[PDB]
Amino acid sequence: RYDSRTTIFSPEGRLYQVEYAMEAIGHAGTCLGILANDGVLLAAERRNIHKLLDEVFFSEKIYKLNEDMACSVAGITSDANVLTNELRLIAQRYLLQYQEPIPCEQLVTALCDIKQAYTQFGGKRPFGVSLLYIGWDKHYGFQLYQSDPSGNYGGWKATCIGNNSAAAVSMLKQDYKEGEMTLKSALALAIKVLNKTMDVSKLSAEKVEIATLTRENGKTVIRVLKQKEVEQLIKKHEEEEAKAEREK
Amino acid sequence: KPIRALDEGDIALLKTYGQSTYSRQIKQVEDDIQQLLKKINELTGIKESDTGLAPPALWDLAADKQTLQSEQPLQVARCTKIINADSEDPKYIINVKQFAKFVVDLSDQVAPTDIEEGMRVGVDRNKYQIHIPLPPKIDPTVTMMQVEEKPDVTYSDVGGCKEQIEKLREVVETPLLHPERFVNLGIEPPKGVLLFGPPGTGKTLCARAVANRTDACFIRVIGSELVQKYVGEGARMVRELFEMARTKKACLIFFDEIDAIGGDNEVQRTMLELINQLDGFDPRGNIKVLMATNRPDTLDPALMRPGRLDRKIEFSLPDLEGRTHIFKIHARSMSVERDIRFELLARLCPNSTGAEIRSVCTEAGMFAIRARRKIATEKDFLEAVNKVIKSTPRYMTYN
Amino acid sequence: EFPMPNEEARARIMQIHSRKMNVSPDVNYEELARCTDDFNGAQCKAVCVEAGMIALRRGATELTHEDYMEGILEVQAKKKANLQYYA
Amino acid sequence: TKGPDAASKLPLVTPHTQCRLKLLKLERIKDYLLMEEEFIRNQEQMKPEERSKVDDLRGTPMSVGTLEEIIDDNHAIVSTSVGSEHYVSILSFVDKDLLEPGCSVLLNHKVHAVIGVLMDDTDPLVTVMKVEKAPQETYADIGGLDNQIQEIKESVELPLTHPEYYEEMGIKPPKGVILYGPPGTGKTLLAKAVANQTSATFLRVVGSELIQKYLGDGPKLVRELFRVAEEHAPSIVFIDEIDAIGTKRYDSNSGGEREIQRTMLELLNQLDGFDSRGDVKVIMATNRIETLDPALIRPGRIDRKIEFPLPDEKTKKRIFQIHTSRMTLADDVTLDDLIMAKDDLSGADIKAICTEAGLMALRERRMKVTNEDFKKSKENVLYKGTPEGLYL
Amino acid sequence: TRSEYDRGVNTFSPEGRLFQVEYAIEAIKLGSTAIGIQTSEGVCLAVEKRITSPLMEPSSIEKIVEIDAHIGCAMSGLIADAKTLIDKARVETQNHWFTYNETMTVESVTQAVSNLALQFGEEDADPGAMSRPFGVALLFGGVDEKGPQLFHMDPSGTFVQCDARAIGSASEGAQSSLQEVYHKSMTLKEAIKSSLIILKQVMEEKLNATNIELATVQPGQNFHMFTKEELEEVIKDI
Amino acid sequence: SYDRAITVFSPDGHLFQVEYAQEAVKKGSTAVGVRGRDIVVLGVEKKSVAKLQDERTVRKICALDDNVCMAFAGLTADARIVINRARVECQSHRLTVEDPVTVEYITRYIASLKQRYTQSNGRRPFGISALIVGFDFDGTPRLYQTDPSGTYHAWKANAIGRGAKSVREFLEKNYTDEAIETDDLTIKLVIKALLEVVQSGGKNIELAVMRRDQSLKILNPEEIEKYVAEIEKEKEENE
Numbered sequence A: 001r002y003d004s005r006t007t008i009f010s011p012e013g014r015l016y017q018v019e020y021a022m023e024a025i026g027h028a029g030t031c032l033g034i035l036a037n038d039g040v041l042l043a044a045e046r047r048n049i050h051k052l053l054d055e056v057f058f059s060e061k062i063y064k065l066n067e068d069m070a071c072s073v074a075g076i077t078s079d080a081n082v083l084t085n086e087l088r089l090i091a092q093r094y095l096l097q098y099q100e101p102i103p104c105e106q107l108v109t110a111l112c113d114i115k116q117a118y119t120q121f122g123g124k125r126p127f128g129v130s131l132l133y134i135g136w137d138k139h140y141g142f143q144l145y146q147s148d149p150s151g152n153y154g155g156w157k158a159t160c161i162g163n164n165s166a167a168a169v170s171m172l173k174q175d176y177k178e179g180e181m182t183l184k185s186a187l188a189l190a191i192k193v194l195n196k197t198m199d200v201s202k203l204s205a206e207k208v209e210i211a212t213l214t215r216e217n218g219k220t221v222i223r224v225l226k227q228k229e230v231e232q233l234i235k236k237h238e239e240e241e242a243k244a245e246r247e248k
Numbered sequence B: 001k002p003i004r005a006l007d008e009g010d011i012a013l014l015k016t017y018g019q020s021t022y023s024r025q026i027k028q029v030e031d032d033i034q035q036l037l038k039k040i041n042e043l044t045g046i047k048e049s050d051t052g053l054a055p056p057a058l059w060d061l062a063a064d065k066q067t068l069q070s071e072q073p074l075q076v077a078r079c080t081k082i083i084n085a086d087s088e089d090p091k092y093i094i095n096v097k098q099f100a101k102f103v104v105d106l107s108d109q110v111a112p113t114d115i116e117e118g119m120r121v122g123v124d125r126n127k128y129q130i131h132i133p134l135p136p137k138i139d140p141t142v143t144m145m146q147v148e149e150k151p152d153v154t155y156s157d158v159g160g161c162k163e164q165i166e167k168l169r170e171v172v173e174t175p176l177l178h179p180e181r182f183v184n185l186g187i188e189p190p191k192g193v194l195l196f197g198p199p200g201t202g203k204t205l206c207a208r209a210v211a212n213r214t215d216a217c218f219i220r221v222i223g224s225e226l227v228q229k230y231v232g233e234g235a236r237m238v239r240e241l242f243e244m245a246r247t248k249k250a251c252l253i254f255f256d257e258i259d260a261i262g263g264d265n266e267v268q269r270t271m272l273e274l275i276n277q278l279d280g281f282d283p284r285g286n287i288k289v290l291m292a293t294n295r296p297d298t299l300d301p302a303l304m305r306p307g308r309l310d311r312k313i314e315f316s317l318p319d320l321e322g323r324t325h326i327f328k329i330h331a332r333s334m335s336v337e338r339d340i341r342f343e344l345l346a347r348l349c350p351n352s353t354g355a356e357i358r359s360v361c362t363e364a365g366m367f368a369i370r371a372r373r374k375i376a377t378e379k380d381f382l383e384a385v386n387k388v389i390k391s392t393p394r395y396m397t398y399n
Numbered sequence C: 001e002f003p004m005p006n007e008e009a010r011a012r013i014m015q016i017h018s019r020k021m022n023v024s025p026d027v028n029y030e031e032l033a034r035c036t037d038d039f040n041g042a043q044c045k046a047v048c049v050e051a052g053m054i055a056l057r058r059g060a061t062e063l064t065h066e067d068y069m070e071g072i073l074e075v076q077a078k079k080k081a082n083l084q085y086y087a
Numbered sequence D: 001t002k003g004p005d006a007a008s009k010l011p012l013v014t015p016h017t018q019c020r021l022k023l024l025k026l027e028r029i030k031d032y033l034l035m036e037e038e039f040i041r042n043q044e045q046m047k048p049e050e051r052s053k054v055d056d057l058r059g060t061p062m063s064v065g066t067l068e069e070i071i072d073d074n075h076a077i078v079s080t081s082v083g084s085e086h087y088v089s090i091l092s093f094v095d096k097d098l099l100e101p102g103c104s105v106l107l108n109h110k111v112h113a114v115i116g117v118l119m120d121d122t123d124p125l126v127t128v129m130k131v132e133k134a135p136q137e138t139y140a141d142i143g144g145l146d147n148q149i150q151e152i153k154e155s156v157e158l159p160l161t162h163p164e165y166y167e168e169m170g171i172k173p174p175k176g177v178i179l180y181g182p183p184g185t186g187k188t189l190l191a192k193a194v195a196n197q198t199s200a201t202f203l204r205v206v207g208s209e210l211i212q213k214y215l216g217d218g219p220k221l222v223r224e225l226f227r228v229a230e231e232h233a234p235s236i237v238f239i240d241e242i243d244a245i246g247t248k249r250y251d252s253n254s255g256g257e258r259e260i261q262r263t264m265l266e267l268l269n270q271l272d273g274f275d276s277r278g279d280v281k282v283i284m285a286t287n288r289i290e291t292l293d294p295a296l297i298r299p300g301r302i303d304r305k306i307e308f309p310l311p312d313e314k315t316k317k318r319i320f321q322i323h324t325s326r327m328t329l330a331d332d333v334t335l336d337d338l339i340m341a342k343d344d345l346s347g348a349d350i351k352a353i354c355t356e357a358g359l360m361a362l363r364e365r366r367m368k369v370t371n372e373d374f375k376k377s378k379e380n381v382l383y384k385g386t387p388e389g390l391y392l
Numbered sequence E: 001t002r003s004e005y006d007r008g009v010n011t012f013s014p015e016g017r018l019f020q021v022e023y024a025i026e027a028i029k030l031g032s033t034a035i036g037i038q039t040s041e042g043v044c045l046a047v048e049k050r051i052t053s054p055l056m057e058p059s060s061i062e063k064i065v066e067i068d069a070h071i072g073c074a075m076s077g078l079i080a081d082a083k084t085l086i087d088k089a090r091v092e093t094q095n096h097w098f099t100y101n102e103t104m105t106v107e108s109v110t111q112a113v114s115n116l117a118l119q120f121g122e123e124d125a126d127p128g129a130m131s132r133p134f135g136v137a138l139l140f141g142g143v144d145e146k147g148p149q150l151f152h153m154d155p156s157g158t159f160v161q162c163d164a165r166a167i168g169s170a171s172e173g174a175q176s177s178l179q180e181v182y183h184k185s186m187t188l189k190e191a192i193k194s195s196l197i198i199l200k201q202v203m204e205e206k207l208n209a210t211n212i213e214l215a216t217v218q219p220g221q222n223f224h225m226f227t228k229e230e231l232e233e234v235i236k237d238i
Numbered sequence F: 001s002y003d004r005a006i007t008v009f010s011p012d013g014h015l016f017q018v019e020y021a022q023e024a025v026k027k028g029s030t031a032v033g034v035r036g037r038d039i040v041v042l043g044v045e046k047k048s049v050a051k052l053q054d055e056r057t058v059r060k061i062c063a064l065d066d067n068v069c070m071a072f073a074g075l076t077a078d079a080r081i082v083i084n085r086a087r088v089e090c091q092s093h094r095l096t097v098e099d100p101v102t103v104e105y106i107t108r109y110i111a112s113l114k115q116r117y118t119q120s121n122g123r124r125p126f127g128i129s130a131l132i133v134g135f136d137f138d139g140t141p142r143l144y145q146t147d148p149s150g151t152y153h154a155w156k157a158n159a160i161g162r163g164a165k166s167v168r169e170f171l172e173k174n175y176t177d178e179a180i181e182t183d184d185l186t187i188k189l190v191i192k193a194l195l196e197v198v199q200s201g202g203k204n205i206e207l208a209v210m211r212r213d214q215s216l217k218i219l220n221p222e223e224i225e226k227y228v229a230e231i232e233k234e235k236e237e238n239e
């Protein structure tokens, strides 16, 4: 059949290796990002915390790339690390060449060009990694982009990739009020999405990984939600859910 | 929004509400129509079969009563090994169709000489003794064994197989027409040839052409016939056809679709009988066998051994000149214009068998019929070859 | 072990397969044998058969060795390719 | 031979809009049916030696066998239905000229001498395989497939009607035609339409029906079917689902596979048996055309091959018009958004979409289907490609 | 079992045949017919356009191209493969005009083009080159010191002097016709009439202005491709 | 067999990988380009964004240079790569010869790049088809179509992507000399060609127009509704 090296074309025109790289992301941890009026956030699931992981870390799924850049990863760990290192490399190369933080579109296109080159030629397996870039620029303010192992990308305001990503994005689009969400509403929506999309009746703060990017006073600050902060957020959501169910 | 089951009130309202005033009458009339049709079909019935009674001018009723009482019914059986009768063991194995096999004696009417292995023996119903041999009396005008004396197709009709037709000419004519040349060259005349090539190449037609030229009668035998119901006495079939060929003058035996026969108990009887009628029959006869099937290997290995079928003629898909000749041959029998570019059509159908060519001509005729024109045009042939052959890519990268 | 007929074995095979045809002594089996390099057994029988066939093709011209020569040329390779792009 | 016993074919009522004209036409048909039943019943009421002795000579009961050989004018080789065959006599009263290998001779129960011949023997299977009531579907009920309908009419209708063109051009009428395409395209509907408009005997066959358990019953059934078709000439044989027996020929090991191969070789032989000039044509339909034997579809056996592609946009809208021609649609239903959506909608899919839209309308206690009902129905009935984003 | 020798160009068949090169040869039969005739007064090239759509711009379909003012070209095969072959031919002609400052003969032109061809099975392809045989047949015509000259180039890299050669989907029929309709002292005008006659006889569609491109090279004038009006004048006679 | 090898000829002389790459364009989205007396237009079928995708970065029509534009169909990533290479080559050609790149030159470069990507193993062919439009510096209307095989052709009005055959027949039946007399007539022609396949109108349609050297502005979503309203007005006018 036509399931050999990626540089092959099915008679119907499909790139089967690229398609398998697509469908492989469904095995990765669920991560989503939402665009709010005055902030952006990345919510990711810690699928593997058994009992004895040191948690010596800043974020596993979320990776900071530049003083204005942050992204979440979903795919094979090796390709994840390679893509993140290349992201840092290209961002700093743009900063050196132009003395300006790299735009989100430009960096995303650079990474996607690399990924396409990894499926265009050479007999090399495509990067089985899908990304969710978060950042700010003077060109378009706050932007969210969802990458793709095929080398495609798209500008989104709400997107979930990983396991159960289809249902998560479906309910998210069913429950997204564009242009009228602050950071708090976006955080609550992300918590509700993670509740509905993960296989736990009461998800813990350990399984949740949230990082928020916000531009304030001339500079953009990227911070991951501390343990106390994320615990307070999830408890606020569970009391909101309790209020909703008792009212019903 | 939960679906709500249609309540009885909703069912009642929805049924009547908006409806034709005539709708009730229409439905009743249609139902009555169906009931009336059923009633007619019930009251016609009982159509009389009227079995095959001849007019009373032919009924000798007393004689039929006497033949009913006297004439015994004999079951039909297939005989088998003679078990060395020689008047000391007058017994034979006979297989009474699906009933059973038995070992039976003769009858006073019959003699040992006309009973051997393999023919149809009429055994009785008590002792099962063979009471009359019933030769299949096949001589089959009701089925295959074409038995065509001088086929209408001639040397001009066959087109393209020039090398093939020349090899066939040699083998089945130079001994047949000039026996003295083979005699004075000290070589037995070619015992036969196996005409192998892809199906539809026309090997049958080329054989019939040489048959018409030799003025020797052409015998075509199918294999599926004696694979299907007429199995068993196929040995006697080929026995009697070879016999009548001996009675006949110079002949041309031709086995097509023989792959079915070659590819086996009664079948094995058929080819060992033809071994007896080819090796045992002197190879000097004028009953030359013309073997022909697509398969060059499925034939039993004991068949092409020397002293038997000696050469093989490899038919191949017609070339450009062959294809245009076939096109002209098939279009001669059609109402077309006189300026049809048959070379163009031959070019447009590469690697196309002769059957595909005749189908292309037929489709051109149908296309001409479609526009209700009595004469087929070149455009019709172009559309026909576009339809049959090929059952942007070749126009945008090649040029 | 059955070895490939060497030269005189080739001649012997040619001879054996040609005793039923009215072949004259004008022929030279030894030359045909030394022209049967790489030939193996049944190939020589095909040589004899084809030689007889063209002896008929020449017009039933019995008593010929040139037919044996041409037969040695054609045998299995009787089809002549006529293939382009070969210098 | 007796001519074509076509279907009943009650006259079609044209309005179909539940109006007075429909009532008039239906009442007229009912009136004619009533005067037919009156006549048949009253003529049943009004007005009332050698044959008995020949019945006595025949005896009781009389077995039915198939003639296979005739040695002399007073002896033959009949075969009972079991499979056994006997050398039996022919009594005088049996009309000889009707005796032809393959008939149905009537045999005495004891000493199975031929005492008569049965013109009509058709076994229950081949009898039900014959169409009696023409299907209500018609070419008007077929949307699109103009080329397909045109080809089928050229194949099984033009030789039946005025055929002078076929021999005027010198080409043979197309012996047999096969329809292929994805499931639900219209292969069986186009055969129903042919049966509705035919003037010849139509023989519907399931294909898998021909196979029978007992040895020799399969080829016998096929032989009887085509013998009926010829004897019922002109006739049309519709072997639906030919792939049930039409699969690739392979060497057989088990007895059942040998019987299956025997049945198909019999079918192929009998397809070869009749001349193309004969007025018996075969029509075969399948979804897996590629899995058929490349000898049943030989140009010398089945020249035509009618393709049934998934309907295009205009054919889709034609089918939608046909299946919504009996609905009480509103003025808002565009019906164009549905045929827009680049999908693999077929005729069956469009019909199911219409039915589902009607069911949505019923679900809203309304009998007027709207665009929203069609919208939900299309998603409801469509089950189950390229990832979104690769191909723009 | 020819399949094992089918894959790849570096595999020899038991009959010693280069099957992939043979397939490249047969890939010419998918190109439109091109006819070139050699005459003492010059050489003419006639081709079949095979217009896919009346909307297409005819000038884009380049069956006949100019390698140099003194030489002409006709093509049948893959458009891409040809384009590379034509560019190499023009580049080599200009290289000869640079180094030797003379008009290089059409025989040397086809020699150089064949040198670019027949290089599929070579190790010099490391920087990047064709790993498969070129699938386009070349018809080279022009005038040189030996008078007018026509050369046909084989996808394997073989070239031969042909007095009248036809390549394309209809090489066999057009060549068979040219076999008996060609004559040595045939004039250029009657040669062009003969070429158009063969093209009409072999074309699938009727003969008009947009079905044929016509080129001619004579010792006096340079390479001339027949314009619309010249095509009408030469096609009204036929 | 002979299908899973880019540089292997089939027995019938087909490079089946190249044809498969060509067919992969048919799975894209319709894009029709028409050239007029003074205008060239690029009509594409825009995929309807569900609820969140930013249309600003789903660019289907992209400008290689100030004098050339192009619309692709068949693979977004390969399209992006060839777009970047095309603009890099346009800038390099303007560096080498200082005059703006003619449509023929950039089309030839794109075709040669795709060809060199379909002549060796380990290099998958660019599975897109491009419609190059623009004006040469002398002011002539030229439109070009590039095939994944690496070949290019000159078309007066061509369509690519899915349903390109139907739009092709529409243009064959409707491309007239007077149909391009004015810019509005060409716009009407291209809109009608698009609505032949994308029947909804309004949205799902993107147009870019090029008059004589003005740095084309893609028709923004304020007059596309106006232009389709004029189209409907004419449509009810003649019927």
Ligand SMILES: Nc1ncnc2c1ncn2[C@@H]1O[C@H](COP(=O)(O)OP(=O)(O)OP(=O)(O)O)[C@@H](O)[C@H]1O
Pocket: D141, D142, D143, D144, D145, D182, D183, D184, D185, D186, D187, D188, D189, D190, D285, D286, D287, D319, D322, D346, D347, D348, D349, D351
């Ligand atoms: N062209 C058409 N116009 C109208 N209705 C159609 C059309 N094609 C199919 N249909 C509808 O599809 C239904 C089923 O079609 P049909 O029985 O002909 O399918 P088929 O192609 O023979 O399928 P299969 O081979 O899978 O049994 C019909 O009852 C009819 O209502």
Ligand SMILES: Nc1ncnc2c1ncn2[C@@H]1O[C@H](COP(=O)(O)OP(=O)(O)O)[C@@H](O)[C@H]1O
Pocket: B157, B158, B159, B160, B161, B198, B199, B200, B201, B202, B203, B204, B205, B206, B325, B326, B329, B354, B355, B358
């Ligand atoms: N060389 C030929 N010249 C004319 N007709 C041919 C030729 N070859 C095949 N045909 C056509 O093929 C049809 C029958 O083919 P047939 O001889 O049965 O094929 P096969 O080679 O399998 O025997 C005839 O109608 C005949 O006209």
Ligand SMILES: [Mg+2]
Pocket: D187, D188, D240, D285
């Ligand atoms: Mg069906």
